[PDB]
Structures are given as structure tokens and as C-alpha cells.
Amino acid sequence: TGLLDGKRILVSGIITDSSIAFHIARVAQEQGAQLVLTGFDRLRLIQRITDRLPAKAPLLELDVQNEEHLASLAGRVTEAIGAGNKLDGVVHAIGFMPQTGMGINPFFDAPYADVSKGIHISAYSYASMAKALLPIMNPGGSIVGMDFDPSRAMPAYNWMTVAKSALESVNRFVAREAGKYGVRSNLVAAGPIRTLAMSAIVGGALGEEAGAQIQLLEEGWDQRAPIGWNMKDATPVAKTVCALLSDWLPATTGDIIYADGGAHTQLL
Amino acid sequence: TGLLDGKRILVSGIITDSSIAFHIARVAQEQGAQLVLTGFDRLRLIQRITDRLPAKAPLLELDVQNEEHLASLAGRVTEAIGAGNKLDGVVHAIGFMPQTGMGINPFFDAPYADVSKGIHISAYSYASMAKALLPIMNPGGSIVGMDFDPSRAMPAYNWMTVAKSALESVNRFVAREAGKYGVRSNLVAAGPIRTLAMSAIVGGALGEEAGAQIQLLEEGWDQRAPIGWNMKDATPVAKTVCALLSDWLPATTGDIIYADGGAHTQLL
Amino acid sequence: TGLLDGKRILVSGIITDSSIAFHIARVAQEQGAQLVLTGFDRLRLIQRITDRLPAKAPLLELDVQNEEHLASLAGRVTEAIGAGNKLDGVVHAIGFMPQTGMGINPFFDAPYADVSKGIHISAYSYASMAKALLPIMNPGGSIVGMDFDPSRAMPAYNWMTVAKSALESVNRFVAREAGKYGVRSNLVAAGPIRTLAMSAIVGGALGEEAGAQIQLLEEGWDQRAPIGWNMKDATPVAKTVCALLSDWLPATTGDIIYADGGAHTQLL
Amino acid sequence: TGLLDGKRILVSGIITDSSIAFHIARVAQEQGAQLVLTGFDRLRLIQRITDRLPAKAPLLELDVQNEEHLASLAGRVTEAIGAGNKLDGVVHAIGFMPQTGMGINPFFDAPYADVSKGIHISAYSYASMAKALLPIMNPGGSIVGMDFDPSRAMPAYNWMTVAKSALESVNRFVAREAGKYGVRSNLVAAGPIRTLAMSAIVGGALGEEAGAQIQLLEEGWDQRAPIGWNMKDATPVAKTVCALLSDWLPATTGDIIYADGGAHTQLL
Ligand SMILES: NC(=O)C1=CN([C@@H]2O[C@H](COP(=O)(O)OP(=O)(O)OC[C@H]3O[C@@H](n4cnc5c(N)ncnc54)[C@H](O)[C@@H]3O)[C@@H](O)[C@H]2O)C=CC1
Ligand SMILES: NC(=O)C1=CN([C@@H]2O[C@H](COP(=O)(O)OP(=O)(O)OC[C@H]3O[C@@H](n4cnc5c(N)ncnc54)[C@H](O)[C@@H]3O)[C@@H](O)[C@H]2O)C=CC1
Ligand SMILES: NC(=O)C1=CN([C@@H]2O[C@H](COP(=O)(O)OP(=O)(O)OC[C@H]3O[C@@H](n4cnc5c(N)ncnc54)[C@H](O)[C@@H]3O)[C@@H](O)[C@H]2O)C=CC1
Ligand SMILES: NC(=O)C1=CN([C@@H]2O[C@H](COP(=O)(O)OP(=O)(O)OC[C@H]3O[C@@H](n4cnc5c(N)ncnc54)[C@H](O)[C@@H]3O)[C@@H](O)[C@H]2O)C=CC1
């Protein structure tokens, strides 16, 4: 019962319970949504994490680079939600960039093969997912992906920033396609969230200066966010995704909502 | 009962029942909000329009250019909502630009006195209102103003576009001040809505070519909006304002939400 | 002889020899331009400063708030450059915001009268100047104003940022008018330059925290500028204005060139 | 002799004499630059076209997807310009997107392999080129790539728009690397230019509706460009690239210059 009551919503992107997609799933369920989850490699792992969601959700394997996964995905989803039932909501919370595309590995040293894979998973998959899923979405539906504002360059994020810029562009095109279905497509630009991966990088897994830069990045974010930014709390982000999954932003599409504390609106 | 349940919200900007602020008020009430309304010149008129709101709301006179109105405004509001009661929400839906700052009057011919008055009412008043009202707002509160995307120049809107650019800038500063109160400040960038004024301009009240350009503007908007744009329906806008007035965009401030059909994300 | 050879160019905005407009004038003359200068209040003062320009330039009084100054300005300019001679170039380097609109004076405490005056001089005057001068500009001509990127809020700059946002908007409209003359209109967004006024603010003239914030602002600018930023050197800015005054950016109008070290393209 | 006098400048991207890079090369030579050209597949063809350049230029093979081409590229260039001679300028004018990523082929139907190749050539190659060439560039140097404003989605350009968004992002990162060399990196966002490829698409080579949309795109561009836009003339673009290759935009990097008639600053 609540914001998303009665809505059926596929949430990709759970890998640990500190995944942003975990909290989107959690908040969505608290808000009445019925979910279908997708999970990339470690399905036993993800099933076990998602057990802690306030409700059961069928989990489906989706490797966004796997053409057959995508080819089969809408059938598997209507299996999970039942025939004559369509999705109202799709959450893309998938992202990856090989280590060479990030951190201390010099920007120019990331091999295109690595960059392409990251763009595949992080950008192009937003379109793949919309292609697989728009056929099984209701008018009034809503696709949401997870963005990290790439409008300016920053240390360490390197090719993942480039991947996010591609994503923003994809999302504008997905909006165009989604529009034919009465469906909105939008990104949520989140502030830095202390995801397991993020904590690794902060603690030096991608090099000390990268880890140092990201820590400075985090602190500056909260400093300039007029409402502050708490990187340890994904809930404001999860709620924002739910905001877009709902009927309360019905004239917004091709767009980016900044759940970033307002940090992007402030220079210092 | 609903999105705004229990929230106390001042809504400025009702002048006719096709005022965008009428529908924000309507939707807000449908959603559980308790309102205080403010009304500019024709208070008998506005009282009579707002009678059609699904609930009663105290109406208070506010001329945003009247220092005493603003000086007295928070007292009058706690009178209306009761002592020890604070606002959760503030809607700025005020805008005006003298005729010389718009339409067929050449851009260079608008006298500064006229432009200044328009900027006063349309931009600076967003700050005035936040100054008067932040003292009587709860943490978690939300100020919302009404924007018309001025990031590119357009025919006929002339100095009102300039006034909107000023407003976007003001809002970023208001966010900074509002943040000290745990309060968000944001604009909703709406698509063209057929307000009484808009219909006048379309029908030539500001000159035929202006009226012609705005009609083209309207049609192009709906053409490029991937979800379409219905200028006769302010509801998607009103809902978007409610989205921001709620707890569902809690990490967004200093910001602009585009309730414009997605038209701004598309070139053609 | 050089970039601006043969071009006749009005340069407003000289008040001291550390005025950005001093260096634009200097570089423009080094580059072959013939100048007409305008000067606001202290004409004896400005004449004496401009004596150090590599060439003579007629100086003309222009108070951008003085309707008669503007009304008479094009006659005075053709007097200065000779009948049947038209301007190729116009440099708006004028800006002012009362102290209440800046620094430590709380944002909400700037009286509209003060803000309006600042917007008058800093934003609306860009249009006034184009109105006075477009009648006496050649096809292929170029108007340039001085911008400080107001796309995000910052400490201390307060209402001057708002004034800059208005200016960016004005410039897009001026481009539209200027286009009818074969004339481009553009802003140069400069990095912080240690102008006499700036040095005052840094040293606390507008309050210690403002002065502190602006110093941090300056340092962060140079830190994130991939090519660095030297606030003590206005030459890169002056050259950029000359770039726009020339024939080398002939397809650019309504636009903003960032002579800011690239600082705006970088987050950290 | 002129703007680029004495500058040594590698210009990629000539394939026909209506290549934008042909005209950049032409204008650069008219302006005193000494060039080294690179050419992708049809080297006999390109040699024969470039014979019409006002001066000789060594032509070097560069397939931007060929790691060995890039690995060897700086040696070949110092061979061509002579030992102890460094580049002042680099022009990236390379772009390609497989047909499936464009026009009438539905956006969702472009296979990632196709999109990746386009992003490789159109975006990632900007970084490859800067990596190969920054070692042989002088302080004060300038890399320039060719952009088509992808900030909003448009018909037919599909994945090439996405590729341009990636490019804008790459360029911000290249600026960071280039900065260590005293080198600027910037894009020129050009208006639609009637290149041979463009004419094909207009005449239906990628589908009739795509061809129709691009024609509408072209016409709207010139309509909203306050100075007009002539798609048949690449010279304003070529001059703009030269503007960036010169010393006249010395404080600009990570940036985008819009040689688009001012069309992007205008809504209608
Ligand atoms: N952590 C942060 O500070 C921010 C993250 N984001 C975005 O949020 C989204 C979710 O990531 P986080 O929660 O941070 O990280 P996470 O590591 O918890 O989730 C990333 C997800 O991507 C999935 N994934 C990777 N490759 C996949 C593939 N081949 N097919 C299907 N799924 C695949 C992983 O299984 C994982 O669940 C990502 O798009 C990320 O870029 C946006 C802003 C900030
Ligand atoms: N109509 C449209 O297409 C769009 C309008 N907007 C904005 O929506 C807001 C509301 O306007 P609309 O509903 O369109 O028009 P409206 O005419 O219905 O409302 C404008 C309101 O401004 C109030 N106002 C004018 N001067 C005032 C003053 N001195 N003090 C206090 N209030 C004053 C009027 O009383 C009126 O209620 C305005 O900010 C407008 O610029 C934004 C996007 C599009
Ligand atoms: N100093 C900086 O860090 C930056 C300054 N700018 C802009 O550069 C432009 C020139 O200012 P600066 O060289 O910094 O300061 P400045 O103090 O040297 O020049 C400002 C000029 O405005 C003129 N002015 C003020 N009121 C006027 C009026 N009523 N009529 C005619 N002229 C009037 C003054 O006489 C003065 O010459 C201004 O637009 C400023 O906002 C832009 C970016 C950065
Ligand atoms: N034609 C237009 O309306 C606009 C084009 N641009 C950009 O201008 C740049 C130059 O293209 P145009 O002159 O229009 O087209 P063009 O077809 O004349 O030049 C494109 C160049 O890319 C080169 N290229 C393709 N694959 C390559 C590879 N593997 N390695 C090395 N070079 C390769 C081709 O040989 C060709 O010279 C491109 O980046 C394009 O996207 C930007 C805005 C508008």
C-alpha cells in the first residue's frame, strides 16, 4: 500500500544489500509495488540478499550483455507476473566499467575493449532493457536508470563518466521509443553512495590517488549540497526513483532527476 | 488523504480557475494537504474561484511587491493555520511582465521600469516569499516556483524569458538559504499551458506575429514531447509540483523539474 | 595590424588599468583595432588611465542607466569615428551590484531597489547598448559582454550571479536582434580576475566570510582548470573577447565562450 | 601567413573535398599553418583530393581503430615535420556510425557491435589520437574535434548522437590530460553541413522518413540560427576550428564552441 500501490516493477541491479537497487526495491515494496527482480551473475547470492526485502519477488537472471537473456526476458517476466499482466515500471540500476577505465589507470590507457564493455553494460543496456521490456509495459509506465552526473569531468571516474554521458544520451532516445507506449524514461542522477564498490575505491582498490580524489569528491558534495548529502544513505535516491516510477511526475521524460542533495546546482 | 497528507501548504498564484496554481491547489487538497492561499489584487474574485477547491482554504492578500504584505505575511499565515503550526510547503506561482516586455513590442523597446517590475514579481519575489516564509516552515519542507524554461531564447516571451532565467538563478540561491531550515527549493519548468493570459496572446493580444509564434511554439512542444504535451491540461504540472511538495524528492534542491512532456530533451 | 585590423570597436568598462576592459582595449589595439571608449563616471580618471593604451581612443561618457547618454550615444560615436563610418565591434564590460546584493549581506536582505539597479547596469544594459549601437554597426559585426558563469550558485556573488543569469538570457535575445544586422552577440564567461573590486572583496570589504569564500573559489578554479587559471592575468580573457570580435568565430552567436581555464568543465 | 602562421597541425578526417576537414585544412593553410594530414582507407583518393589544398601536406595513414597505426603515428609525424619539431595543433574530424545505428533502422535494433564501432571511431578515437599525439605537441598546443550537439535527442542521428555525447565527455577528460602538456582540448559543435554522406541521407539513403527528418532539421536550424545557417558552406566551421587552433582562445579547454549559427541558443 502507498505511492506505487498495485504497480508491477522490474528492478535490476541488486548485488549486495548496499546496492542502490536493493533500497529502490525495498522502498518500492514498502510503497505497494509488486516486484520482479533481475540479477546478474551470482543468482544464489542475490536470492539470499533479496530474501530480506519486505516481500517476495521473483528473481530472473539477466546478463545485460547476453542477447538470449534479453531475447527471453519479457516471456520470463510475464511468467513471473502472470499472463495478461504487464509491467508498470522498470528500474535499470546496472553499471560497470573495467578497472582500466577507472581510477589510477591513466585515462588514455583504458583499452577500447574495456571501455566498450563498460559502455555496453552501463549505457547501451538501458536501451536493451527498454527494448526487451516496452512490449510488456502498460501505458502510464516508467523506466528509470541510475545516472551519475557526467556533465563535467572528475578524477577517477574516467570512462565510467563517459559511459554515463552515453547513458544520458541513450535515455533521451529511449524516451522517444518509450513515448509510443505511453511510457516515460528518465534517469536519476544520484550523489556518491557508499556502495561496496565505492567503499573499495575509497579505500584504495583503484589506486591511492583515485581513492583520495573520490574522498574529496564525496566531501565536496556534501559541503555544496544545500541540504547536505549522506553517502551512507541510499534511501533519498531510492525514494526519488519511486517518485519517477509513480504517477507524480507524469509530464517528465527523456529527463534527469538529480537526487544529489542539490550539489550540482552549487559551485562551491 | 494521500501524497501530501497532513502537509500545510501555502499556494500563491490563483487568479482564475485556469491558473496553474488553481490546479496545484486542487491536486494538493485531493492529496491531503491543508492549504493557505494567497491572492494578489482581486481578493473577492479569488475567494469566489477558490470556493470551487475541494476544501476550504484561508485566502490571504499578498502583493509580492508590497513590503508590508511580506513583512506581515508569516503572522497572517500562523493566524490562519494556528499557533505552533508551521508550513510544510510553499508554492510560488506568480509571474508578470508588462506588455512592453513581451510579444510584438520590440525587445529593445521594453523600458527598464517595465522589465524591473516583471523581474520583481516573476523572479525576485521567489526570494521574498522564501524570506517571509522560511521562518514558519518545518524541516523537510519544500518551496516550489513555476518556471518556463528560459535556457534558449524564443519569440514573444522576451523579457519574461529573461525574468525566468533570473528566477532559476534565484532559486539556486534560495535553495542555499532554505537548506539551513531543512527545506528544499525547486522550480517546476512547465510546458505552455492555456491559461487565460496565454489564450489572449495566442489570439493576438500582444500582436499577431507574437500570437502566431506562440502557437507554433505550442505545436512544436507537443510534436517533440516524446509523451506529447496537452496545453489545455495543467494537471500533469500540478501533480509535478505536488511531487516536489512531497517527501518523494527529498535529495532534490536548487533544482528544476521539467513537467514539459519531455519537450526540452528533444531537438526535433 | 593583426586579428582586428581595420575594425572599429567601442569598448565600455574601463575604470582602472586592472579593468578587464583595459586589457581588451589594449589587446584590441595591439591587434589593429581602432577604438572608441566609453567611460562611466570619472571621465578625467578614465582618460588618464586610457592614455596608457598603445593608441589614442576617443572616450565618451556613458552611464548605462542614463537614457540620454544612450539616446545620444550613436551620434557621439559616429562623430568620433567619422561620418559614413560604422562600428564593427562593441564590448560591454559593465557590471555592478550594490553591496547589499553581495557578499556577507544575507541574500534575502538585498532590497529590490538595489537588485534592480544591479540588474539594470549588469544585464539590461547589454540590451540598451545593443539598441543604441546596432544602428551604427557593419554586417559581420560583433557585440561582446562579460559574463561570470552563473549556472550554479556560489557564495558571496549572490545577486550579481542572478544578474549574470539575466545577462546570459538577454544576450540570447540580443543575438536575435543583432542577427538582423549581420551582427553576432556573445558573452565571454571569464574566470575570477583580480580586479581592484575583487581584491577588495578578497581582503574583506564585503565581509570576512565572503572574502574567505571567494578566495576558496579562486583557488578551486585554478585547481580544476585543466590549463590552470591565473586570476592576476586578464590577457587570456582579453584575447578571447578579441577572438569573438574577429572574423574567426563567424557562426557563433547568442552564445557563451568560457575563458575560464576550462574550470567549468571539471567537477573537481 | 596569418592566424595560424608557423603552426604545425595534423588534420585528420579528409575523405572528399566536401569533408569538413578539407576546409579546416584549407583555411588552416591559408592562415600560415603547416600541415600533416591523416587519411583513413582510400589513401590514393585522399592524396588526390588534398592535392587541391593551397599547399602540400604529407598524408599519413590512420585508421583510428588500428592500434599499430596509433602506436606508430607520432614517429611517422615527426618524420613528416622533422626531428625536434613538435605539433601545435591536432584536428580530429573523424566520425562514423554503422547504418544500423542511424536513420530509419529502429534505435533499439542497432546491435551493440555496430554501436561500439561507431563509438570507437567517433568518441574513443578522440582520446586515442590525443594519446598518440600529446607526446609530440608543444606547450600552447590545441586539439580540436568535431561535435554535433547531442544535448537533445533528434530523429535519425540515433546512435551517432549517443556517440557525440560520449565524445563531449571524452573531450573533458582529454582536456585534463592535455593540460599537463600546456595543451587545450575542445570540440567544435557544427551545424548540419552538406557533406557527401549528409546529402545521401537527405536523399534517402538511410530511409525516407530519416531523410525527411534531417531535411526538417536542416531547415529549422537555419530558421532559428539568429545569423542563419548555410549547410552548404563549411567555411564558418573551418574558421571556428582555426579560432581554437590559434592563440586567441587560450583560456578555453574541455569545452565546446558552437559554430552552428547560434541555433542552439534559440528554441524557435
Ligand atoms: N554508487 C554510487 O555512488 C552511484 C552509483 N550510480 C549507479 O547506480 C547503479 C547501481 O549501482 P550501485 O548500486 O552503485 O552499484 P552495485 O554494485 O550495487 O550495482 C551495480 C549492478 O550492476 C549489475 N551488473 C553489472 N554487470 C551486469 C550485467 N552484465 N548485466 C546485468 N547486470 C549487471 C551488478 O550485478 C550490480 O547489481 C549503477 O548504474 C551506478 O553506476 C549512480 C550514482 C552514484
Ligand atoms: N501559462 C504557461 O504556459 C506557463 C506559466 N508558467 C508560470 O506559472 C506561474 C503561474 O502563472 P499561470 O498560471 O500561467 O498564470 P496566472 O495568470 O493564472 O497566474 C499568475 C499569478 O501571478 C499573480 N501575480 C501577479 N502579480 C502579482 C503580485 N504583484 N503579487 C502576487 N501575485 C501576483 C497573479 O495574481 C496570478 O495569480 C507563473 O509563474 C508563470 O510564469 C510556467 C510555465 C508555463
Ligand atoms: N573581475 C572578475 O573576476 C570578473 C568580472 N566579469 C565582468 O567583467 C566586466 C568588467 O568588470 P571588471 O573588469 O571585473 O570590473 P571593473 O570594475 O574594472 O569594470 C566594471 C565597469 O562597469 C562600469 N560601470 C558601472 N556602472 C556603470 C554604469 N552605470 N554605466 C556604464 N558603466 C558602468 C564601471 O565604470 C567599470 O568600468 C563586468 O561585467 C564583470 O561583471 C566577468 C567575470 C569575472
Ligand atoms: N556533416 C555534418 O553535418 C556534421 C559533421 N560533424 C562531424 O564532422 C566530422 C567530420 O565529418 P564530416 O566532414 O561531416 O564527414 P566526412 O565523411 O567528410 O569525414 C568523416 C571522416 O571520418 C574518417 N574516418 C572514418 N572512419 C575512420 C577510422 N576508422 N579512422 C580514421 N578516420 C576515419 C573518414 O575517412 C572521413 O574522412 C565528423 O566527426 C562528424 O561527425 C559535426 C557536425 C555536423
Short mmCIF file of N, CA and C in Angstrom, two decimals, chain B residues 205-261:
data_model
loop_
_atom_site.label_atom_id
_atom_site.label_comp_id
_atom_site.label_asym_id
_atom_site.label_seq_id
_atom_site.Cartn_x
_atom_site.Cartn_y
_atom_site.Cartn_z
N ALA B 205 -3.43 39.29 -28.49
CA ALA B 205 -3.48 40.42 -27.60
C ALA B 205 -2.15 41.12 -27.49
N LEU B 206 -1.06 40.42 -27.84
CA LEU B 206 0.25 41.04 -27.79
C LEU B 206 0.83 41.21 -29.18
N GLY B 207 -0.04 41.22 -30.18
CA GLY B 207 0.42 41.30 -31.55
C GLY B 207 0.24 39.99 -32.30
N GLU B 208 -0.01 40.10 -33.59
CA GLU B 208 -0.35 38.95 -34.38
C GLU B 208 0.85 38.03 -34.55
N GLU B 209 2.04 38.58 -34.79
CA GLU B 209 3.16 37.69 -35.06
C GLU B 209 3.53 37.00 -33.77
N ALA B 210 3.41 37.68 -32.64
CA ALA B 210 3.69 37.05 -31.35
C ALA B 210 2.74 35.90 -31.13
N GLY B 211 1.47 36.16 -31.41
CA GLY B 211 0.42 35.20 -31.24
C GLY B 211 0.67 34.03 -32.15
N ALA B 212 1.01 34.33 -33.41
CA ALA B 212 1.46 33.29 -34.36
C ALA B 212 2.67 32.45 -33.87
N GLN B 213 3.66 33.10 -33.26
CA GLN B 213 4.90 32.41 -32.86
C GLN B 213 4.65 31.46 -31.71
N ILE B 214 3.73 31.87 -30.83
CA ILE B 214 3.44 31.16 -29.59
C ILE B 214 2.61 29.97 -29.98
N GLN B 215 1.83 30.09 -31.06
CA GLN B 215 1.02 28.97 -31.49
C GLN B 215 1.95 27.91 -32.06
N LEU B 216 2.92 28.37 -32.86
CA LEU B 216 3.97 27.48 -33.38
C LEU B 216 4.77 26.85 -32.29
N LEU B 217 5.09 27.65 -31.29
CA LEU B 217 5.76 27.18 -30.09
C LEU B 217 4.94 26.06 -29.46
N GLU B 218 3.65 26.29 -29.31
CA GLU B 218 2.83 25.27 -28.65
C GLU B 218 2.84 24.00 -29.45
N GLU B 219 2.63 24.13 -30.76
CA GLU B 219 2.58 22.93 -31.57
C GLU B 219 3.90 22.18 -31.61
N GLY B 220 5.02 22.87 -31.66
CA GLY B 220 6.29 22.20 -31.70
C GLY B 220 6.55 21.46 -30.40
N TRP B 221 6.07 22.01 -29.30
CA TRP B 221 6.24 21.43 -27.99
C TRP B 221 5.62 20.02 -27.93
N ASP B 222 4.36 19.95 -28.34
CA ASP B 222 3.67 18.70 -28.32
C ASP B 222 4.28 17.71 -29.33
N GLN B 223 4.69 18.24 -30.50
CA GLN B 223 5.38 17.42 -31.51
C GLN B 223 6.65 16.80 -30.95
N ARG B 224 7.48 17.58 -30.27
CA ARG B 224 8.72 16.97 -29.74
C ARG B 224 8.70 16.29 -28.35
N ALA B 225 7.71 16.65 -27.53
CA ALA B 225 7.46 15.95 -26.28
C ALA B 225 7.30 14.46 -26.59
N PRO B 226 8.23 13.58 -26.21
CA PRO B 226 8.01 12.14 -26.53
C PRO B 226 6.68 11.56 -25.94
N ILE B 227 6.13 12.22 -24.92
CA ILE B 227 4.86 11.73 -24.34
C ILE B 227 3.74 12.70 -24.70
N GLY B 228 4.06 13.64 -25.59
CA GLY B 228 3.05 14.63 -26.00
C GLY B 228 2.94 15.69 -24.94
N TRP B 229 2.30 16.77 -25.30
CA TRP B 229 2.04 17.82 -24.39
C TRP B 229 0.64 18.33 -24.65
N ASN B 230 -0.17 18.36 -23.59
CA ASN B 230 -1.51 18.90 -23.69
C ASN B 230 -1.58 20.21 -22.93
N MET B 231 -1.45 21.30 -23.67
CA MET B 231 -1.51 22.66 -23.13
C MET B 231 -2.81 23.04 -22.43
N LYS B 232 -3.86 22.25 -22.64
CA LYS B 232 -5.20 22.53 -22.07
C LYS B 232 -5.30 21.85 -20.72
N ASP B 233 -4.35 21.00 -20.39
CA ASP B 233 -4.37 20.31 -19.13
C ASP B 233 -3.18 20.68 -18.25
N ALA B 234 -3.42 21.48 -17.21
CA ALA B 234 -2.44 21.81 -16.17
C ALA B 234 -2.20 20.71 -15.10
N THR B 235 -3.02 19.68 -15.09
CA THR B 235 -2.88 18.60 -14.10
C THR B 235 -1.50 17.91 -14.01
N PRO B 236 -0.88 17.56 -15.15
CA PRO B 236 0.45 16.95 -15.09
C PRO B 236 1.48 17.90 -14.39
N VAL B 237 1.31 19.19 -14.58
CA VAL B 237 2.10 20.20 -13.94
C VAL B 237 1.80 20.26 -12.47
N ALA B 238 0.50 20.29 -12.15
CA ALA B 238 0.06 20.39 -10.75
C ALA B 238 0.58 19.19 -9.97
N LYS B 239 0.54 18.00 -10.57
CA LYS B 239 1.00 16.78 -9.93
C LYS B 239 2.52 16.80 -9.67
N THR B 240 3.23 17.39 -10.62
CA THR B 240 4.66 17.52 -10.55
C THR B 240 5.04 18.42 -9.38
N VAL B 241 4.39 19.60 -9.27
CA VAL B 241 4.55 20.46 -8.08
C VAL B 241 4.28 19.69 -6.78
N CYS B 242 3.22 18.87 -6.76
CA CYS B 242 2.91 18.04 -5.60
C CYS B 242 4.01 17.03 -5.35
N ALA B 243 4.54 16.42 -6.43
CA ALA B 243 5.74 15.55 -6.35
C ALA B 243 6.89 16.19 -5.54
N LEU B 244 7.19 17.45 -5.85
CA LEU B 244 8.19 18.26 -5.14
C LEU B 244 7.76 18.71 -3.74
N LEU B 245 6.46 18.88 -3.53
CA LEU B 245 5.96 19.27 -2.23
C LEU B 245 5.99 18.12 -1.28
N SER B 246 6.08 16.91 -1.78
CA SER B 246 6.05 15.70 -1.02
C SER B 246 7.42 15.31 -0.52
N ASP B 247 7.48 14.13 0.05
CA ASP B 247 8.69 13.57 0.62
C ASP B 247 9.34 12.66 -0.37
N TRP B 248 8.88 12.68 -1.62
CA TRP B 248 9.38 11.72 -2.60
C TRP B 248 10.53 12.19 -3.48
N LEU B 249 10.93 13.45 -3.33
CA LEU B 249 12.10 14.06 -4.00
C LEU B 249 12.93 14.80 -2.91
N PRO B 250 13.34 14.02 -1.91
CA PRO B 250 13.95 14.56 -0.71
C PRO B 250 15.43 15.00 -0.85
N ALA B 251 16.09 14.65 -1.94
CA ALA B 251 17.50 14.88 -2.19
C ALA B 251 17.61 15.87 -3.36
N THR B 252 16.48 16.51 -3.66
CA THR B 252 16.47 17.49 -4.74
C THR B 252 16.11 18.92 -4.32
N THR B 253 17.09 19.79 -4.61
CA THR B 253 17.00 21.16 -4.26
C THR B 253 17.89 22.07 -5.14
N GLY B 254 17.50 23.34 -5.26
CA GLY B 254 18.21 24.26 -6.11
C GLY B 254 17.93 23.92 -7.55
N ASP B 255 16.91 23.11 -7.76
CA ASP B 255 16.79 22.33 -8.98
C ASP B 255 15.57 22.67 -9.80
N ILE B 256 15.51 22.11 -11.00
CA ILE B 256 14.40 22.33 -11.91
C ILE B 256 13.86 20.99 -12.39
N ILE B 257 12.56 20.77 -12.19
CA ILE B 257 11.87 19.60 -12.71
C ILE B 257 11.06 20.06 -13.89
N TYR B 258 11.18 19.28 -14.97
CA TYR B 258 10.62 19.69 -16.23
C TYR B 258 9.34 18.90 -16.42
N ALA B 259 8.23 19.60 -16.31
CA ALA B 259 6.93 18.98 -16.50
C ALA B 259 6.52 19.59 -17.83
N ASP B 260 7.11 19.06 -18.88
CA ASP B 260 7.01 19.70 -20.16
C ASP B 260 6.81 18.70 -21.26
N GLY B 261 6.47 17.45 -20.89
CA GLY B 261 6.25 16.36 -21.85
C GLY B 261 7.55 15.72 -22.29
#
